[PDB]
Amino acid sequence: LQDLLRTLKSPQQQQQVLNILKSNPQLMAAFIKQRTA
Amino acid sequence: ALQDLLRTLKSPSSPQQQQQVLNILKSNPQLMAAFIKQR
Amino acid sequence: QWEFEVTAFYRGRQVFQQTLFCPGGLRLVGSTADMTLQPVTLPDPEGFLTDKLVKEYVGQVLKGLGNGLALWQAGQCLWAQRLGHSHAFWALGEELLPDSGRGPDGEVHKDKDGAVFDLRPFVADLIAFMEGSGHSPRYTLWFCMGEMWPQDQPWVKRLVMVKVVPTCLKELLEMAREGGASSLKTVDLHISNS
Amino acid sequence: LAEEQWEFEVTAFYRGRQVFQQTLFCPGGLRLVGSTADMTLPWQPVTLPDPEGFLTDKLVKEYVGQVLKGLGNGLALWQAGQCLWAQRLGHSHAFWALGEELLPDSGRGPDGEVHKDKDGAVFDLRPFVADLIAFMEGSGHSPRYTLWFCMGEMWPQDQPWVKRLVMVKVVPTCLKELLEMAREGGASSLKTVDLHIS
């Protein structure tokens, strides 16, 4: 929810990244595992 | 003459840039004659 | 639909690069234009190259595009079809180098069944990349127009090479590298005093 | 001091990503350095960028910075006696070869190694002029002008050049323009072609 997204100073690119994130929960678990560990 | 061998560009090159091309052409009459061969 | 970064190379020279969002589909045509419903016109080789024989053949390849190469997304997959006389071969690679060691991943179909990219292998490779596999999933699509795929020969000698990069997939890999995942698994640093 | 230097288009690639491209005319010679060096004439320092603002792979970013640290006083480039020369003033070794403007040759080894001394010639105008003449006569082979430098690692033989940490491309603009003049006169390198049209 725009939290795991980088802060880089293309709105369609942002929502299309979020759509792939929510469509694959395994991608969420691997992305969360990087910063939590 | 000689300068006629240079290319014509939309944005011109500086004289010092073209001087590096002319020095090679003057120091090499073999290369300068081949460019005239294509004229 | 996905946003694409399109880049075209004429005889190893970048002659076009734009990042456009076409919800009606992509279309890579030449000067012989035609409106059908978004077209992406490739530039004329006159204002970019000086080799007369190369400019004549690039134009012949751009003529063979006809109504151009179409590209779109459907069901977590990218599909590419050609609507002209020139054949087209595609493969995945890096952003600055197509893979010339191996052949192409296939020829661009002449019907609607393109299937040049699937999101499912990309996610599976990206998860392993973050788990520590050291292999980042490739996302750059290369298209060789009007010629065979440059196998065992420099890709810069091909007449027309088009690079298509989905911007959403590019950022999804940058987020993994920003999170600690790396691909640098081999390096022999030649540094020393002597 | 030196004189009659050539203008160079310098381009740097970090892990196959273009991070630097400038057209430099340094009449007192130039030095490609890895950090902000003090402005010194002769041998003008040319600072390659910090990989922090261009890369996100931490391991690649650390090793690219390790190569940039090994540049030391820099890679000196200068023209002298119808030839181009290269000398590494730091600890990181460097290998060079001629190639294309967007592709170094990975099927062969480097033409040589950058000398630590001052006798490291990386280009000679004699074969360039001879090949350019033959190119205008119908040889189908254009003379090469693009100088590639692989910094800190071995030359990428049978390996994608985009995997190298630091690749620097040096193009003398006077040589590229001379080849554009030959191609404008009617010469060509397109000997082989095989169009697939149906």
Side-chain angles (χ1 to χ4, degrees), chain D residues 97-116:
Chain D
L98 292 103
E100 309 300 315
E101 197 158 352
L102 277 74
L103 180 63
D105 190 5
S106 292
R108 298 182 178 182
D111 294 329
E113 190 180 336
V114 172
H115 289 10
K116 290 185 285 186

Side-chain angles (χ1 to χ4, degrees), chain D residues 42-104:
Chain D
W43 310 110
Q44 171 176 348
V46 177
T47 303
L48 294 181
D50 185 6
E52 180 65 30
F54 297 93
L55 301 177
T56 59
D57 191 316
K58 262 70 175 185
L59 278 70
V60 172
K61 205 151 51 182
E62 291 283 351
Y63 266 89
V64 165
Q66 195 79 12
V67 175
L68 297 179
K69 286 172 180 293
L71 294 185
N73 292 333
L75 174 60
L77 305 177
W78 71 98
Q79 137 76 27
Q82 315 159 20
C83 298
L84 260 40
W85 312 80
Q87 167 183 15
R88 51 147 177 163
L89 303 169
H91 292 148
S92 61
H93 297 243
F95 301 92
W96 67 273
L98 292 103
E100 309 300 315
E101 197 158 352
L102 277 74
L103 180 63

Side-chain angles (χ1 to χ4, degrees), chain C:
Chain C
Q1 205 70 209
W2 291 356
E3 167 177 304
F4 293 139
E5 172 186 329
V6 181
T7 309
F9 301 86
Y10 295 168
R11 191 76 165 176
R13 282 202 203 176
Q14 181 172 341
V15 302
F16 181 86
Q17 183 172 67
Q18 288 180 357
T19 308
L20 265 304
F21 183 24
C22 45
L26 195 69
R27 223 202 304 178
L28 311 177
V29 310
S31 73
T32 70
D34 189 303
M35 167 50 60
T36 299
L37 286 175
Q38 180 171 341
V40 182
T41 301
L42 293 181
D44 190 296
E46 174 56 68
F48 292 90
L49 302 176
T50 53
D51 194 328
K52 211 281 180 60
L53 277 67
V54 173
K55 294 186 299 178
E56 287 281 358
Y57 261 91
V58 167
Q60 264 285 347
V61 173
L62 294 179
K63 285 181 180 180
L65 295 181
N67 281 275
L69 168 78
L71 181 62
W72 68 100
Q73 190 271 353
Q76 294 173 325
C77 289
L78 258 51
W79 314 78
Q81 65 173 17
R82 64 170 178 90
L83 302 176
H85 288 295
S86 284
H87 293 269
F89 302 91
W90 67 272
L92 280 173
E94 271 65 25
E95 297 188 18
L96 278 70
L97 176 63
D99 196 353
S100 180
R102 61 186 292 104
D105 296 353
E107 182 177 7
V108 170
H109 292 194
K110 48 183 59 183
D111 51 282
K112 59 148 190 172
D113 308 7
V116 296
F117 184 86
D118 189 1
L119 184 57
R120 293 214 291 253
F122 181 86
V123 180
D125 297 332
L126 186 59
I127 294 174
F129 177 66
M130 291 173 291
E131 285 181 332
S133 69
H135 179 57
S136 52
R138 281 184 280 183
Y139 56 91
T140 297
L141 285 165
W142 290 90
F143 294 92
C144 184
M145 306 305 190
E147 299 185 86
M148 198 90 73
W149 182 262
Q151 186 173 358
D152 290 325
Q153 50 180 152
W155 74 271
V156 297
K157 298 306 176 182
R158 280 298 177 266
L159 293 169
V160 179
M161 292 287 302
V162 181
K163 164 178 62 174
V164 178
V165 174
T167 60
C168 65
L169 302 175
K170 180 180 183 179
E171 262 287 349
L172 201 58
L173 181 60
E174 301 294 322
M175 298 166 57
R177 294 169 175 169
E178 192 63 31
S182 180
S183 62
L184 191 65
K185 85 183 199 67
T186 164
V187 47
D188 188 10
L189 218 52
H190 263 272
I191 59 173
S192 60
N193 279 12
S194 300

Side-chain angles (χ1 to χ4, degrees), chain B residues 5 7 17 20 30 38, chain D residues 5-7 136 177 181:
Chain B
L5 285 169
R7 291 171 65 241
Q17 284 168 355
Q20 299 171 162
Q30 230 176 16
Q38 289 186 145
Chain D
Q5 297 299 287
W6 295 356
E7 167 179 294
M136 292 178 290
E177 185 66 20
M181 292 164 58

